[PDB]
Ligand binder design. Structure first.
Ligand SMILES: NC(=O)c1ccc[n+]([C@@H]2O[C@H](COP(=O)([O-])OP(=O)(O)OC[C@H]3O[C@@H](n4cnc5c(N)ncnc54)[C@H](OP(=O)(O)O)[C@@H]3O)[C@@H](O)[C@H]2O)c1
Ligand SMILES: NC(=O)c1ccc[n+]([C@@H]2O[C@H](COP(=O)([O-])OP(=O)(O)OC[C@H]3O[C@@H](n4cnc5c(N)ncnc54)[C@H](OP(=O)(O)O)[C@@H]3O)[C@@H](O)[C@H]2O)c1
Ligand SMILES: O=C(O)CCC(=O)C(=O)O
Ligand SMILES: O=C(O)CCC(=O)C(=O)O
Ligand SMILES: [Ca+2]
Ligand SMILES: [Ca+2]
Lengths: 412, 411
């Protein structure tokens, strides 16, 4: 007997993550759950075939059904075009999806009692609230061919005025230029959910910017946050014996490095992206981090793995070599989507399973069964022997059996 | 010791206090220079309408060596704090825009200082691009619905290319425009490659070319074109390599590395990542920062951290404090060393190095600031007996620099 799951939007990806995603479905999802799954193949071949429409279609299904689970995808550059014989150098599916849905990507490492960190202090978790909208992820970058003038212009809707700003005057040779932006409502939602997360977890909140250099752009964030804090959350923080503090990114990164964790870190889009990878790695592995996009509507979520398609490990796989790619971040992408689905649908069993799987995952690693990366945390990469770890198939076989054991034990 | 021509930039807050101690105890008692001093303090800048900065920058150009103390970059709160005419631009953005080049940043290590990042056993050198991007950009507020368009217009004026950045349909927000020059990128690559070869370590350039295909792609394209057509052979001979990576991957790789590489960074990335790297080895006060200009003759040395406002507020409150002066002493040594290099000066070169060795020796001897004591004992366990206050630490350095030089004169 399987659990009556509900409506889940599914997005298939590329390379190593594609191989893993199917193994998750085959072994951990479908033998226990019955879903009205809405699959979109966001692999580079089908994206190129549909002229990236499948990506737009996948984002719209998430709006409709409120739950989306995404597999890591290839964002094409010149090399990829040449590799896959692509029509165009397509935009990142994540950028496309995130700009349509909006909200905040909450990124948090998954801990195991036996997995040593690279950063000594981090005894308490760090949660990054990455602003999933605007900035460099909806930018307008172009190449300046030669001497000329680059200008950024603004024209209000009423046609009553116009502002022109000199970006630069290329007096000799060419170069590059780019325009980027953000909206107040998007920043406001970001602030709201950033403060809300701090209260639910009971931790101080930090907002990093470079407002000293970007006095207007970065200052708008600093102000919008502060205003909403003073006028809507200040008292509640004092109630919970926590605080909100804006800091320059410079200070912030150095502060976290020497901290002991236990704080919500509100991050501007780009900083969120880079810093979650620094954080993930500092705890242990890049394959050991949850990533959930919480939309401003309070009811829609998009869960994924923070890492990419693990191209390097996939090339070993193609060559027929031994592979040990971490599927935990991709497994939790499923458990987090299902956990929210259960919450939306008042589903006791689905919630139980979503959690059961997360516990199964951690327990297996805490039992000595892990991938190479996790073995490298224990013994150090140069000292890692073959017997120390399990391969991607071997590790999914252990998770599979342990999950069968756990659910059978649950039925009493 | 006649040092020669050295451009000096006075600073602000805690670093303004320390700067005078380096001059009072460690530089003037042993060196007499043609000090072209410029006060880049927040008051003088406001008085001179930021001209002193533009002048200090043109002075480093003429004299080829400049030493800079940390300065306050004004925001809205500082305009209230100092009663400012305007929110003046960072003296650093001005100086770096006029001079150009790469800011090479590296942590100063001591055998007794535990790190925060377990694996860093070889040094990480950041090659920060000192020009363009977020540091000479136009940002502004969009107060309501309307269009934001970026446009390029060639010199001949026979073409125009507009570009919709965003059409704001309901409500406003913020918008910004930024740029970088092909020649500056070319200079950056040249210095990065040359740095890799001198040190004998691989080079890694990190960008976001999958997102900013045209902009970050020009950086990836210039580095590869130069490496292939000029340095590949030189690299391959020393068993070293060049490899471009996405910033995400680079930071995760740096964290799990043993160090031992040159990290070429876009202006912003260099800014932030150099702080992550400095704190990871130990503290923000334990890092060298040198701007190496495209002529290869010009250099501007400085401290990577800020003016240390939290420390300066205690000093203002008549409180003891314990701030790291090494980062700021090395700004002096690294300038004096380059001056000696251009001048072909033997004594000044010997002295610049002597001061560096004393600095490290004192800390490995056990005489240190609070930051370095927190590395050993952990901040919740540090006692007053474990460290020295800023004056006390400068007293030991001064005493030891006196020992070293008298011992050096083989007397
Ligand atoms: N969510 C997304 O859709 C997303 C996010 C990021 C990147 N990407 C895309 O993925 C492609 C490749 O990106 P990339 O190679 O720079 O980044 P990546 O796929 O995250 O992998 C970079 C390196 O990180 C380590 N790593 C990442 N995930 C791991 C896991 N689960 N288990 C063990 N190690 C893991 C591996 O290091 P070692 O080789 O040293 O073991 C790997 O080679 C690009 O096309 C990019 O656009 C997509
Ligand atoms: N190159 C430059 O001219 C430069 C660079 C960056 C910032 N700034 C300016 O500095 C001002 C204040 O900056 P900020 O407060 O953001 O950063 P900061 O000056 O670097 O100080 C922030 C924190 O970093 C630690 N720290 C930094 N340097 C230290 C040292 N030498 N010894 C011991 N601890 C050190 C202290 O940590 P604890 O709190 O734990 O004691 C301190 O509170 C701003 O006005 C900014 O514009 C100047
Ligand atoms: O969209 C991409 O190309 C990579 C996505 C990424 O870096 C992230 O989501 O953390
Ligand atoms: O110009 C500034 O405000 C200083 C920026 C900074 O932190 C640096 O020099 O790395
Ligand atoms: Ca990322
Ligand atoms: Ca900095």
């Amino acid at each position: 007997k399987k659990i009556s799951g509900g409506s889940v939007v599914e997005m298939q990806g590329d390379e190593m993550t594609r191989i893993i995603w199917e193994l998750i479905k085959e072994k951990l999802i479908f033998p226990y759950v019955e879903l009205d799954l809405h699959s979109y193949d966001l692999g580079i071949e089908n994206r190129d075939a549909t002229n990236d429409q499948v990506t737009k279609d996948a984002a719209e299904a998430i709006k409709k059904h409120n739950v989306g689970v995404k597999c890591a995808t290839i964002t094409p550059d010149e090399k990829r075009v040449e590799e896959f014989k692509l029509k165009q150098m397509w935009k990142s599916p994540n950028n496309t999806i995130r700009n349509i849905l909006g909200g905040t990507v909450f990124r948090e490492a998954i801990i195991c009692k036996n997995i040593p960190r690279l950063v000594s202090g981090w005894v308490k978790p760090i949660i990054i609230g990455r602003h999933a909208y605007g900035d460099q992820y909806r930018a307008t970058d172009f190449v300046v061919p030669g001497p000329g003038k680059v200008e950024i212009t603004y024209t209000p809707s009423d046609g009553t005025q116009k502002v022109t700003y000199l970006v630069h005057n290329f007096e000799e040779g060419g170069g590059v230029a780019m325009g980027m932006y953000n909206q107040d409502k998007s920043i406001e939602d970001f602030a709201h959910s950033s403060f809300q997360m701090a209260l639910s977890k009971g931790w101080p909140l930090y907002l990093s910017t470079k407002n000293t250099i970007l006095k207007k752009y970065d200052g708008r964030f600093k102000d919008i946050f502060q205003e909403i804090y003073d006028k809507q959350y200040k008292s509640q923080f004092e109630a919970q014996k926590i605080w909100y503090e804006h800091r320059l990114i410079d200070d912030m990164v150095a502060q976290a490095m020497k901290s002991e964790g236990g704080f919500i870190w509100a991050c501007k889009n780009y900083d969120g992206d880079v810093q979650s990878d620094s954080v993930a790695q500092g705890y242990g592995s890049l394959g050991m981090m949850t990533s959930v996009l919480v939309c401003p509507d309070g009811k829609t979520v998009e869960a994924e793995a923070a890492h990419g398609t693990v191209t390097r490990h996939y090339r070993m796989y193609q060559k027929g070599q031994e592979t040990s790619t971490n599927p935990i971040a991709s497994i939790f992408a499923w458990t987090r989507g299902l956990a929210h689905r259960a919450k939306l649908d008042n589903n006791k069993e689905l919630a139980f399973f979503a959690n059961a799987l997360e516990e199964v995952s951690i327990e297996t690693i805490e039992a000595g069964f892990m991938t190479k990366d996790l073995a490298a945390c224990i013994k150090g990469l140069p000292n890692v022997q073959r017997s120390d770890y399990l391969n991607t198939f071997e590790f999914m076989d252990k998770l599979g059996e342990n999950l069968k054991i756990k659910l059978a034990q649950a039925k009493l």
